[PDB]
């Protein structure tokens, strides 16, 4: 038939993580981050690092029989920033280029209905 999986993309201002699981999520097919493809901390969240990691993960997934994925992309969320970093969309485009079919795309950033207090004080970072 068609073996379909899920691509979980975690994108912040400091790094990017691309993690492919099966359709239920309980089994890990492949997992690559920005620090595994570059040597400098400054380049970890760049679009090019996201492309490289997505390509490695997609190749490992294709060798094992995955044909397509559905995509779940998230920023850190909670009491941290709600906006994804610059690597998410580059990672999305690279998966399709490497040979995977793409299903539905959704954002799953966790959002509180008035949760906890964030760091920094009532004055924030002072730079």
């Amino acid at each position: 038939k068609e073996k379909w999986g899920i691509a979980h993309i975690y994108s912040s201002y400091n790094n990017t993580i691309i993690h492919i699981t099966d359709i239920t999520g309980a089994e890990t097919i492949s997992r690559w981050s920005g620090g595994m493809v570059v040597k400098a901390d400054r380049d970890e969240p760049s679009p090019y690092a996201a492309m490289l990691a997505a390509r490695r993960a997609a190749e490992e997934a294709l060798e094992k029989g995955i044909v397509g994925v559905h995509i779940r992309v998230r920023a850190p969320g909670g009491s941290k920033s709600k906006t994804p970093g610059p690597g998410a969309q580059a990672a999305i485009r690279a998966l399709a280029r490497a040979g995977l079919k793409i299903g539905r795309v959704e954002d799953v950033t966790p959002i509180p209905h008035d949760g906890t207090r964030p760091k920094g004080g009532r004055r924030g970072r002072r730079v």
Binding site: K1, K3, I23, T24, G25, A26, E27, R104, E106
Partner: protein, 188 residues
């Protein structure tokens, strides 16, 4: 050796529950079939019944039994897509929510979230009256129907249509939906 470990795994076919058709919804890998129990899969209603309208309705199925290379599931809950309900809430409209705990005719415990969107801003007393209409309709439906019939009428849109027809007399409406369902308990 890592590749060898991946070669021990067999693939199992997952089926939808009996009253949804029992069709094939996917495949999942595992070495021991005991580890397949209690896994959950999310599928849209458009996948089961083919129609390009109900693509935002998401159903969750949980594996409860494995026989051979087949895995069978039960209904666990339902939710509308985040981007869909985000497109409904606007400024200069009113959003009315109601969260109710119910028991079905055959002893199932459920929690049900309903939502109504009014055309313009309305007074607090009118919101309360609409919420009360929602509560009465849902309690009556729970009294009448079994688990399977209630779930089907909730996901098709029948209960919402009854709610909108009843709530027209308080204020004209823009939308009416069963926002979410979760199953809490099952009969002994």
């Amino acid at each position: 050796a890592a590749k060898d470990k991946w070669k021990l795994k067999q693939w199992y076919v997952i089926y939808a529950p009996d009253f949804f058709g029992g069709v094939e919804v996917g495949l999942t890998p595992a070495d021991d079939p005991e580890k397949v129990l209690n896994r959950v899969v999310e599928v849209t209603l458009k996948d089961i019944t083919g129609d390009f309208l109900k693509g935002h309705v998401k159903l969750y199925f949980q594996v409860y039994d494995v026989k051979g290379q087949n895995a069978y599931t039960k209904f666990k809950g339902m939710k509308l897509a985040r981007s869909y309900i985000r497109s409904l809430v606007r400024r200069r409209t009113t959003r009315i929510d109601g969260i109710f705990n119910i028991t079905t005719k055959d002893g199932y415990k459920l929690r049900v979230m309903a939502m109504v969107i009014a055309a313009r801003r309305i007074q607090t007393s009118q919101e309360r009256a609409i919420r009360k209409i929602m509560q009465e309709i849902i309690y009556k439906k729970a009294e009448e129907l079994n688990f399977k019939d209630f779930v089907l009428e909730a996901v098709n849109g029948k209960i919402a249509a009854e709610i909108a027809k009843e709530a027209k007399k308080i204020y004209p409406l823009k939308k009416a939906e069963i926002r979410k369902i979760k199953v809490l308990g099952e009969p002994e």
